[PDB]
C-alpha cells in the first residue's frame, strides 16, 4: 500500500528510449520525485461533454523535482508522445502492469481495456516518503498541474 | 494455433475509434480479409545494419481486401498512428492480448516487454479459410507488403 | 433551419462506407475539429475553363489535423468503392435520404436533371460545435482548394493550443 | 576527419542523468541523429556589441531526429541546464574531451579555457553516414536552429 507518509516502493521501468529507470536511484539524485500516472497517451481530457487535447502536462517542467509520467503504453508510443509535446521529463512504460499494481493505481476495465493506469499523482522525498498523493477514478479528469507544481516546489523547498 | 487451409477463428476488437469489429461480420462483407499483426506502432523497421521508419504499410491499401492491422497498442495510440500515416484501413487494438493468443502470434518477451504481437500476415476468404499465412520471429523484419498485395488480389480474383 | 458562420453546427448521424453510424457531436467529442465536405457525386469529374478531369486532390484533406467527413447523397456501397479506389483515409458519409444536405442548406435543386444533389460545400466545426469556417459555390464543377482548407483547418486546430 | 558522405564514429557519453548513451545504439532506434556541440552551458550568445541568453536551442525539439547536445560540461551542470530551459532532448557530457577530439570539434584555448567544444552540428543517418555538417570558430556565433531543423526533417523524410 502507498499513502501520505508511507515510504514509496522502489521499482524500475523503461523510458521512451528503453533506458531502465530505478526510483530510488532517482531520489538518490537529490531532488524530490513527482510520479504521474495516466491511462493512455494520445488520449483526450474532457468535462461534461467538452473533450480536447489541451493537456497542460508540460507545465510539470516548472517543478523543481524529477518528473516521471507513467502509463502502460509502450516505449515507442511514449517516445512518440514525448517528442510531439516537447516534454522535457521522462515517460516510463509500465507495459507489464507492474508498477500500477505496486502503487494500486489501476482501472480494472476502462472502456473495455483491462488494467489501465488510473490518473494518480505522487510526490516522493529524496528519502522515500510519500509527501503528496492524489487519485481519481474519473479518467477524463485532467489534474491541476499548476497545483502539483506548487506542492512539488513546496516539498522541494522543504529540504531547503 | 492456426495454419493454412484451416478455418480462421472469429473475434471482435475495437478500432482506432473504439468501434467493435467482428471478423466474420467483415468476411460477410464480400471481400477477403487481410490480417496484419505488428509489435508496436511508432516502432522502426531495421535491415542488417540499417533502421528507419520507412514502413511501406500503406501499400496494403492497394489490395482488394479488407485490411485489418492488429497490435496490442491502445485505440488512442493506433488512432494517432493511423492519422499520421494517412492509412486508409482499420487498425484494431488487441489491448487484452486475446487475438494474438487466439492466432498464436505473440512474442513471449520482446526487449523486456511481455506479450507483444509478432509480425504475422493472414489472408482469409469470405467463407473463413486461411488462404495465406506468413510469420517471423524477427520483429525488426518488415514484411513485403507489395507481395501480400499480390497474394491478396490473387485470392480476391480467384473468387472470379 | 440554416447553419451559418459563427453559429453552432447542427448535430446529425449518417452511415459511412461501412454502414456504421457516425454522429457529428460524438466526433467533435473526440477532441479534434471536424471538417465537413459536401460533394455532388462520387466518380464525378471536376472542370476548369473547359478541361474536365478526375484529378481531384481530395486526398489532401488527410493532411489536416481534424476529423474529415466527406458527404454526398450517394449510397454507402458506392462511397465505399470510391473510398477504396482513391485510398482515402477519412470517412465518407452517405446522406442517401437528403437529410443533412437540407439541414445544412447545401443542396442543388436540380443538377443536370438530378434532383436534390449535395452542393460543393466546406464546414469546419470546433470540438464545441461552432462553425469556424464555411465555403460554398453553386458551381458543381468547381473543385475546392483542399490545400487551403487544410491550412484553415490546422489553424483552427492549433488556435486550440 | 568527419565530413559529408563519411561514416560518423561511434561513441558513448553520459547524459544529464549519468545514463550512458551510445551513438550507434541511438541510430539503431530508427531516426536520424542530430549532434550539437557547444562551448559551455549558461554561456551567452553574442554579436559585435550585444549579448544575450536568448538561445533558441529548444527549437531542435521540432526536428524529427534524436537530438544530442554535447559539451565538456559535467552531467550535474547539464542536468541543471536541461531542467532550466525545459529542453526535451538529451545533453551528453564529454567531460574527458573524448568525442570533441574524435569529431575534431574543439577550441585549443577559449578565453583561457583549454579544450572547449566548438559550435558544431552533425546530422547522422540511421546507418551512420554524415548527411550534414556545420562548424564555426566563432564561439559567440549561435547556429540557425530553425535551419538545422529543416535539414533534419528533410534528411528524415528522405529515408521516407
Closest CA to C89 of C72, C106, C65: C65
Residue of A nearest to C29 (CA): A51
Spatial separation of the C-alpha atoms in residues B61 and C142, rounded to whole Å? 28
Which three cell numbers, joined as nine digits, stand for A136? 481519481
Q: Which of D46, D102, D115, D140 is catalytic?
A: D46
- The CB density around residue B34, as the number of other CB atoms within 10 Å, is 25
For C:103-132, CB contacts with A below 8 A are 127-128
Closest CA to D158 of B83, B54, B42: B54
Spatial separation of the C-alpha atoms in residues B30 and C84, rounded to whole Å? 14
Alpha helices in B19-144 (DSSP H): 23-27, 75-84, 98-102
Alpha helices in chain A (DSSP H): 23-27, 75-84, 98-102, 145-158
Q: How far is CA D2 from the centre of its chain?
A: 14
CB D123 within 8 A of CB D33: yes
CB D128 within 8 A of CB D22: no
Q: Rounded to whole angstroms, what are the CA distances from B13 to B39, B131, C130?
A: 16, 22, 33
Tell whether C84 lies on the interface with B, counting CB pairs under 8 A.
yes
Closest CA to B42 of B81, B88, B68, B75: B81
Residue of A nearest to C129 (CA): A50
Domain residue limits, chain C: 1-161
- The CB density around residue D6, as the number of other CB atoms within 10 Å, is 12
Closest CA to C33 of C144, C145, C142, C122: C122
b or e along C33-46 (b: 16 or more beta carbons within 10 Å of the residue's beta carbon)?
bbbbbbbbbbebeb
Q: Do A43 and B76 touch (CB under 8 A)?
A: yes
Spatial separation of the C-alpha atoms in residues A130 and A100, rounded to whole Å? 16
CB D70 within 8 A of CB D90: no
- Structural resolution in Å: 2.6
Spatial separation of the C-alpha atoms in residues B91 and B82, rounded to whole Å? 7
- The CB density around residue B22, as the number of other CB atoms within 10 Å, is 12
Spatial separation of the C-alpha atoms in residues B1 and C80, rounded to whole Å? 33
Give me the sign of the Cα torsion angle A67, A51, C150, B61: positive
SS3 labels along D50-113 = CEECCCHHHHHHHCCCEEEEEECCCHHHHHHHHHHCCCCCEEEECCCCHHHHHCCCEEEEECCE
**Residue A3 exposed, middle or buried by CB count within 10 Å (0-12, 13-18, 19+):** exposed
SS3 labels along A12-51 = EEEECCCCEEEHHHHHCCCCCEEEEECCCCCCCEECCCCE
Tell whether C33 lies on the interface with A, counting CB pairs under 8 A.
no
**Residue D50 exposed, middle or buried by CB count within 10 Å (0-12, 13-18, 19+):** exposed
How is domain C1-161 classified at the CATH fold level? Glutaredoxin (3.40.30)
- Residues of B identified as active-site: 46
Q: Do A74 and B40 touch (CB under 8 A)?
A: yes
Distance in Å, alpha carbon of A126 to nearest chain B alpha carbon: 28
Which three cell numbers, joined as nine digits, stand for A152? 512539488
Q: Rounded to whole angstroms, what are the CA distances from C118 to C37, C72, C104?
A: 10, 6, 10
- The CB density around residue D47, as the number of other CB atoms within 10 Å, is 10
Spatial separation of the C-alpha atoms in residues A24 and C74, rounded to whole Å? 62
Q: How far is CA D6 from the centre of its chain?
A: 18
- Radius of gyration (Cα) for chain C, nearest Å? 15
Tell whether A147 lies on the interface with D, counting CB pairs under 8 A.
no
Closest CA to D124 of D132, D134, D116: D132
Spatial separation of the C-alpha atoms in residues D139 and D145, rounded to whole Å? 15
Q: How far is CA A128 from the centre of its chain?
A: 16
Spatial separation of the C-alpha atoms in residues C145 and B153, rounded to whole Å? 34
Which three cell numbers, joined as nine digits, stand for C149? 482548407
Q: What is the CATH number of domain B1-160?
A: 3.40.30.10
- Tell me whether chains B and A touch (3+ CB pairs under 8 A): yes
B70 forms beta bridges with B37, B92
Residue of A nearest to D81 (CA): A88
Q: Rounded to whole angstroms, what are the CA distances from A14 to A25, A64, B106, B142?
A: 14, 22, 21, 24
Q: Do B18 and A114 touch (CB under 8 A)?
A: no
Pairing label, strands D119-124, D113-117 = unpaired
Q: Rounded to whole angstroms, what are the CA distances from B10 to A70, A80, B28, B100?
A: 34, 32, 12, 12
Spatial separation of the C-alpha atoms in residues C59 and C147, rounded to whole Å? 10
- The CB density around residue B43, as the number of other CB atoms within 10 Å, is 24
Distance in Å, alpha carbon of A160 to nearest chain B alpha carbon: 39
**Residue D89 exposed, middle or buried by CB count within 10 Å (0-12, 13-18, 19+):** buried
- The CB density around residue C125, as the number of other CB atoms within 10 Å, is 27
Amino acid at each position: 500500500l502507498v499513502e501520505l507518509g508511507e515510504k514509496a516502493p522502489d521499482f524500475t521501468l523503461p523510458n521512451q528510449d528503453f533506458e531502465p529507470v530505478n526510483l530510488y536511484e532517482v531520489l538518490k539524485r537529490g531532488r524530490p520525485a513527482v510520479l504521474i500516472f495516466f491511462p493512455a497517451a494520445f488520449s483526450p481530457v474532457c468535462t461534461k461533454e467538452l473533450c480536447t487535447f489541451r493537456d497542460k502536462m508540460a507545465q510539470l517542467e516548472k517543478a523543481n523535482a524529477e518528473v516521471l509520467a507513467i502509463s502502460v503504453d509502450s516505449p515507442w508510443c511514449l517516445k512518440k508522445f514525448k517528442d510531439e509535446n516537447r516534454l522535457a521529463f521522462n515517460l516510463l512504460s509500465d507495459y507489464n502492469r507492474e508498477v500500477i499494481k505496486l502503487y494500486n493505481v489501476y482501472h480494472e476495465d476502462l472502456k473495455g481495456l483491462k488494467m489501465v493506469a488510473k490518473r494518480a499523482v505522487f510526490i516522493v522525498k529524496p528519502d522515500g516518503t510519500v509527501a503528496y498523493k492524489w487519485v481519481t477514478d474519473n479518467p477524463l479528469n485532467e489534474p491541476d498541474y499548476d497545483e502539483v507544481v506548487r506542492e512539488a516546489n513546496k516539498i522541494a523547498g522543504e529540504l531547503v
